[PDB]
Subunit: 131 residues, 2 copies
């Protein structure tokens, strides 16, 4: 199993099961989560959430309260064991039974210690759907 | 949208042999990792970096071959400078042999509309061949 695949799918298990430290422990000190890339509801800034500091906050705002579901439709490994792309569908159910769903390309990168330095989502609000 | 026009223009020129048009779209700090990681097309595994290196990459790996592109899917981000595609790249070599690969291709432009990052998530597993 490649390091980027172990890390990336340990991330999916951690966000799906409320394992905040599990999740944070997978992440390098220089982590840059851009879900998605560019300015949006969850990237207000437009330049992503930086360091374990701001990502802890990001979790407690957008993930810790809710039920997040990751579904993998396709894997696109590269020729490097530290970088992969996927087609995921993300599905956040809020406590009021409100459900936001989005399909996108998600790229990952780990450093030489095996920790995520970059999580990057290719999607916009035009693609998100509500139920 | 600058990244769509850059990217669509990349396919125009590459598919028809227009070397000077292809190079015109790239920045002077360009990095092409087709694919990401160690491959014949990316030997040191860190990509072809700089417009000068890219010219010699062109004459080694593109000019002698016929290349055909099929966009199968498009995943815009919430930034106008960065997009991801699913592409099918078909490379006919000088001896008549054809290699075909599906992968994820991400693009990025700088504030002037010029391509700074062309990155391909594929490897040899997925690649097919004929003739």
């Amino acid at each position: 199993v490649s390091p980027v695949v172990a890390a990336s799918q340990n991330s999916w298990r951690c966000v799906q099961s409320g394992d905040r430290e599990g999740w944070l422990a997978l992440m390098a000190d220089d982590i840059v989560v851009e879900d998605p890339i560019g300015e949006a509801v969850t990237n207000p800034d437009g330049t992503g959430v930086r360091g374990k500091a701001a990502l802890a906050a990001f979790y407690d705002t957008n993930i810790g309260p809710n039920r997040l579901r990751v579904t993998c439709e396709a894997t696109f490994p590269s020729s490097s064991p530290t970088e992969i792309a996927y087609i995921l569908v993300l599905e956040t159910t809020f406590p009021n039974g409100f459900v936001a769903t989005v399909r996108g390309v998600f790229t990952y990168r780990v450093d030489d210690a095996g920790l995520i330095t970059n999580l990057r989502g290719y999607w916009n609000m035009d693609a998100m759907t509500f139920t």
